[PDB]
Amino acid sequence: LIYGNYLHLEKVLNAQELQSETKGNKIHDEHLFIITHQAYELWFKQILWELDSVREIFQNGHVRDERNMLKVVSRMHRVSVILKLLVQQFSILETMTALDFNDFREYLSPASGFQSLQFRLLENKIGVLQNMRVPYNRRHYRDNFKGEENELLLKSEQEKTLLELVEAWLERTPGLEPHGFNFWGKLEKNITRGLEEEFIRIQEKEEQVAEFQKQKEVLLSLFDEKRHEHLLSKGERRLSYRALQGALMIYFYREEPRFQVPFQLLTSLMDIDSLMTKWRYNHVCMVHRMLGSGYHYLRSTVSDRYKVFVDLFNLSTYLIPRHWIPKMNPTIHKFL
Amino acid sequence: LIYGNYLHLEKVLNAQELQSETKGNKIHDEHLFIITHQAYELWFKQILWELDSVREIFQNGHVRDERNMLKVVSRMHRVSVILKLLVQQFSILETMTALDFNDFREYLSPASGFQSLQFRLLENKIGVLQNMRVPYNRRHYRDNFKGEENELLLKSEQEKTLLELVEAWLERTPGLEPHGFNFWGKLEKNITRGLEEEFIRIQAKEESEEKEEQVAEFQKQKEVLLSLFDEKRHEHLLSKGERRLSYRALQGALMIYFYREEPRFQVPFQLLTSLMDIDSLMTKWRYNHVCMVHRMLGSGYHYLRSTVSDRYKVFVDLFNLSTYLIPRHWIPKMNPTIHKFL
Amino acid sequence: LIYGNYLHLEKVLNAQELQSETKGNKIHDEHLFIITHQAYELWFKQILWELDSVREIFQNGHVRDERNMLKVVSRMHRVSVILKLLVQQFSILETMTALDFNDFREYLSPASGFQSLQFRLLENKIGVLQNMRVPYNRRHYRDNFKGEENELLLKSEQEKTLLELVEAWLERTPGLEPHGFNFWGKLEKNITRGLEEEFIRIQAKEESEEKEEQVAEFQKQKEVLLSLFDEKRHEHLLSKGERRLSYRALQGALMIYFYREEPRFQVPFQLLTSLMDIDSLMTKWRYNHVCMVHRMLGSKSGYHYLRSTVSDRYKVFVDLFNLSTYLIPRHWIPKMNPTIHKFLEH
Amino acid sequence: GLIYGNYLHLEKVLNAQELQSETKGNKIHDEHLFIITHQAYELWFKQILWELDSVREIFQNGHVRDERNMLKVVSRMHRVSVILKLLVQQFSILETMTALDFNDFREYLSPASGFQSLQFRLLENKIGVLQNMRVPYNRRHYRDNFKGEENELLLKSEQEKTLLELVEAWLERTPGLEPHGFNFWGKLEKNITRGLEEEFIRIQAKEESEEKEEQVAEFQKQKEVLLSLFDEKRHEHLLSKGERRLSYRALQGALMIYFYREEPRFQVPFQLLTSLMDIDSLMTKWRYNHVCMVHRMLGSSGYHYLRSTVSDRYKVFVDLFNLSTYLIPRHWIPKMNPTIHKFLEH
């Protein structure tokens, strides 16, 4: 009916209990600490809601109908806009001094952010691998959770992640067919050709040739399926070789109509990874200003180990001159 | 003590019920609409908490001890940092299209943002006067409220506002005493002299339109500057609600502006700055809200546009002191002679 | 090639002369005032560069190849990202107090922001109409300029605006053909039918305040929705400048709104969204500028003229916003269906 | 008289954009954005140098001794942090350039590099980045990328008093440290020693349990930390390794201001300390955002050097952050009753 009832403000606005006050020593700034976290958690719930809806669109086959790509990209863009706000939101907690935090910090133990169910659900559903987590005090992340919460966390690890669902979709990208546009075949040939030409051309001058060799190494390593499988097992890469080919197809042919919105999707996945890392960085800096080894553990989380779509960033390494890219003639254009 | 229990997430995260889904027609974006408003309301509660603490510091006399000024200005600064975030937060709801909003809008009636208790408490506690409010549907804002909420709103109108508490503190500003530094007396004299000196320079300037323009400016400025010493004009503008602060409080504020670098006035000057910031940010919030209603409902909108005005700027008198700026050399000299009182 | 030479820093970083210092009374904050404006002007030059490139893609027919829509939308999105930064940039100038501004203001006369060539070029190229400009002190804007600057401004007024180039492209939107999908014909019929059905339902209620309230709302809605099919009212509102797009372009825009998820319309829909964003951000820039003039100069005028610029009179793509007025239940939208689906499948 | 464009020297600022891609007959649209973005960074670096130089001068010439000048000091330092915040947000503009599009004009840039930003180096030096602390790139000194007057300017920047040194000297003179006066350090050592003793008694009184044992463990850690503060030799040692930067006495002054921040004479000094930390944090955020962007454009040498810059070795006021380590219960802080308080009253 009424605003307050529709938003269940009877719950939202009766959820602030200062432990400092419960123990007979109310500290003003504890209220800000509570509200800040409650606001983070409301937005985490919203991100989960968007992300779960996008996972469902992939898992139920709806993504196959390309009419649904706009909704997919809008919701992923919305996740990024929320994360941007969450990064800015640290500026509020920076109005609390370490001295004032020090007056109520004692009443917090043994509570910790490590116990944020939703933050973990979000990491898992995007596709952070448990085996790839940095241990804190030689402990498992789920050790802090019990009951239905531990159950929910397990489901989040076992259900298909955003990374896995995107991977599957990337594997079906049009153009990879050897009997068709044969993208991979043509790309290998064109680059090999071009490098040899560069070889002849070059045949400080000499160190320029030295640089050429480095590029040759990098570019050719792309066609090494085994090296990929090895790096996959480590966890230094995350996407299947075939998904990687699909992604590169979308990068190079981004302007082709069928690939325009898919390209935007890839861009937004990278954005989410970057913003997640920015959130972790801002959080680290705050612990440092307040507590003066959590700080070092948190710093370790600011790493490629926690970047789920690292493969999408790394495709910049394999940029080539435009004229080496297999031409998409109107003859072939039809499929795109 | 576990995170979720300390933050009472059992309440906060079980407070999201889509009306579209309750009526068997779940619309995805209704969830965003709910969360966005819940986040606004959490932050309004935080602003009320800071603002109530500052009101108390004034009302109970603690502000008299100047050691408390840092805390006062930090909390007022913190309110403006929150408001800045609340302005940016509109960007989230701008990811909802009007078409998608149109799919669940029917399930909202009869709820409205108009019915935000906390938003009204915030306006009232800052110092929005009821008699100065633009009518909605040719009726008073409080009619949209009933029961304990209507009663709380009345208390919020009758209890001392931030404007009134700052006013009383401004009235006691050191320097105004006729038997002391006699700021107002000296300021009137120095401006009178300064204007005269200016006139002499102007009349000598060769007959020309440029001179003519300078003459025009001089007359305008003369009018403005001298009008400052007209206590009757002030009382008149107070009754029409075009000004808000007592004449004496205005004198205190101007004292702080001109002598802001003097140690006792440094943090008071920051307080005045922060009060203006809060007014400006409140206005920016109202502007962004208007633009969004327009993008969703098309061309309520007109009432909201009417709220974007000086009628809702409680500390308008602090902004308007820019009108009465004079060259630095006209400002009464303090000097070591009478420097140590500040 | 050195950084400083590539960026011509010998020019950029030797362009700061304080007039207060030239007249023997250096005021520290004047430096901030100079740099802030120089930074605004660099970004205005960048906006003109993006906007000119997009205008050209339309004017030369490149937009007809839908491969170029990604570039169009990325550049329009980039303009909005810049404008958002320019709005935030006011926060720097708010660290200057009015008292400190008052110490060097005298040395500025008779220079004014009104003399920003690039800001005028930007307004003109987007599509602000001269007739719809608020007069300042009963004077025309362009007489503040002379020589080549006056000439550049005239070209900007006479060349095709972004609004006109988008209009032309909207007129060619697939689906409007009476002998084809016949969007307009089907939309008129569906809404007429829908309204009739609605009326019957309400008519069948018992006489009450509630019934009459519903009747009243129905009549309001009916008038709005049906007014859309009145080409003559549209022509009339065009001449008063309350609308800007041709009737046919309006039909194209509504086609893109309703069928946004169809593949050929996905990126076009994003373009329309970005055009609305640019108008909103331009207006936000104007609003933040007004608030600052007030904080520095006080009320009384400049403040009042600038406030008048914050109005729909300066919103070029007002017709895109106002399509929210004509939202209808989803089930009244003519079905696209596989039958004709392909015409919007790339 | 004076016209906007002349006042701002726009004839220089807006004729400073030459695309190397275009000079070599292969114009690439996005190179223009690359140029403008850097030019805008450089304008704001010039503004930060202007504010920072003015504040350095206020310290170096003794003006800071008159506490009337503290408001101007804190406003200008706050203004530096508001600019830096904008500079961090400004990366969002260059993120609208894709790596593919950057790849089309990158070849025309060699051998120019950001490393060659005079102003960025001047800024690092004037704040107080010490040369010995700098990470070498390709086993070279940073200044060897510079020649002529530029090399000379950089040398002056290294030799003149840094903000770190000027703040250090001012912190050493903080009221309250005098053994013959309030004797802050003497009283603080005694109160902490007493407090630790009291704490030990409380814990040892607890009933045998692991929690007690944990509290014992915590106590022993905290005791060592807090008492290590009174070890001037440990401080000298940490200074040599560059893990601390401030003199022992300056550290005492800083802690005095932290604990007595509400006392009137220390209110604005406390804000100054806060602002110095803000600048360091924002400088490191700038370096972080720059790293992330190099990676997204070039992929994963430079990247690793730049990552090494995102470190406490480039935080000049790291000591101000680290004072959080030495927080004690409020009741242990030496009492300042109005009697003694008199010395800290305007």
Ligand code: HEM
């Ligand atoms: C006073 C401000 C803050 C302090 C001092 C602080 C402190 C800490 C510390 C020390 C840790 C490491 C785990 C531990 O030892 O308990 C941590 C982790 C965490 N904090 Fe915070 N925190 C603060 C603000 C926040 C905020 C606003 C959030 C928002 C929800 C948050 C969420 C988290 C999360 C999710 C973790 C786990 C991080 C991970 O495992 O990757 N913290 N925090």
Ligand code: HEM
């Ligand atoms: C789709 C987004 C929104 C729409 C369409 C919307 C619409 C409206 C409308 C039409 C009114 C005028 C009263 C009425 O006739 O119902 C109004 C007022 C109001 N809205 Fe919103 N609103 C939106 C978002 C928000 C948000 C996010 C807030 C955050 C709390 C909010 C707070 C308010 C407040 C407090 C009022 C009363 C303002 C006053 O009297 O000055 N609205 N809104």
Ligand code: HEM
């Ligand atoms: C201290 C800050 C500022 C003051 C006091 C100020 C004052 C004014 C005034 C009074 C006008 C009206 C014309 C006149 O009477 O001379 C004006 C217009 C203008 N100002 Fe500013 N201004 C400020 C900052 C800026 C900045 C940062 C920009 C950025 C480019 C700017 C750009 C303009 C423009 C373009 C106009 C013409 C606007 C229009 O006609 O729509 N000003 N300003």
Ligand code: HEM
């Ligand atoms: C596509 C954008 C950019 C790329 C690819 C890039 C690349 C690089 C690289 C590779 C370096 C290491 C030095 C070298 O190997 O040449 C560097 C350093 C630097 N860049 Fe950038 N940069 C970018 C944008 C910017 C911008 C916008 C600024 C603003 C002025 C900037 C300022 C600098 C500075 C000052 C350094 C030296 C930093 C230090 O030594 O700590 N760069 N950049």
Ligand SMILES: c1ccc2c(-c3ccc4nnn(CCN5CCNCC5)c4c3)c[nH]c2c1
């Ligand atoms: C909710 C409640 C607390 C937090 C914290 C947080 C930040 C700093 C802390 N220092 N001590 N504690 C409590 C003790 N716990 C468990 C034992 N040692 C590690 C931390 C803190 C808690 C951050 N976010 C929160 C949300």
Ligand SMILES: c1ccc2c(-c3ccc4nnn(CCN5CCNCC5)c4c3)c[nH]c2c1
């Ligand atoms: C919570 C619930 C609703 C809202 C609204 C909001 C926005 C647009 C609306 N259109 N109709 N309604 C409901 C009816 N009200 C009252 C009676 N007629 C005027 C509008 C809307 C509600 C904004 N914020 C909300 C928070």
Ligand SMILES: c1ccc2c(-c3ccc4nnn(CCN5CCNCC5)c4c3)c[nH]c2c1
């Ligand atoms: C460049 C140069 C000046 C400005 C201004 C600006 C702002 C406030 C002013 N008050 N007086 N003046 C000078 C005189 N002008 C023109 C003639 N009479 C009306 C005001 C001001 C100039 C804003 N942006 C600028 C950029």
Ligand SMILES: c1ccc2c(-c3ccc4nnn(CCN5CCNCC5)c4c3)c[nH]c2c1
């Ligand atoms: C001005 C000019 C160039 C830049 C760069 C920048 C960024 C990436 C680059 N990749 N190659 N180059 C050119 C070669 N330089 C110098 C010699 N070898 C190391 C890299 C680049 C230049 C960033 N900001 C700039 C401003």
Ligand SMILES: C[C@](N)(Cc1c[nH]c2ccccc12)C(=O)O
């Ligand atoms: C039919 C298909 N949508 C094919 C597909 C997969 N990945 C893509 C990327 C861009 C464009 C198309 C695709 C599917 O099976 O999902």
Ligand SMILES: C[C@](N)(Cc1c[nH]c2ccccc12)C(=O)O
């Ligand atoms: C002792 C006093 N705090 C004086 C006072 C009032 N307003 C001020 C403004 C600035 C500086 C001081 C004051 C009081 O009576 O509150």
Ligand SMILES: C[C@](N)(Cc1c[nH]c2ccccc12)C(=O)O
């Ligand atoms: C061939 C065409 N590009 C068709 C066209 C015009 N407007 C559109 C809007 C959405 C989709 C397509 C169009 C042209 O005539 O430009």
Ligand SMILES: C[C@](N)(Cc1c[nH]c2ccccc12)C(=O)O
């Ligand atoms: C007289 C003095 N301004 C004293 C001083 C030094 N550092 C301070 C920090 C806070 C407060 C005062 C000081 C000076 O010697 O500069």
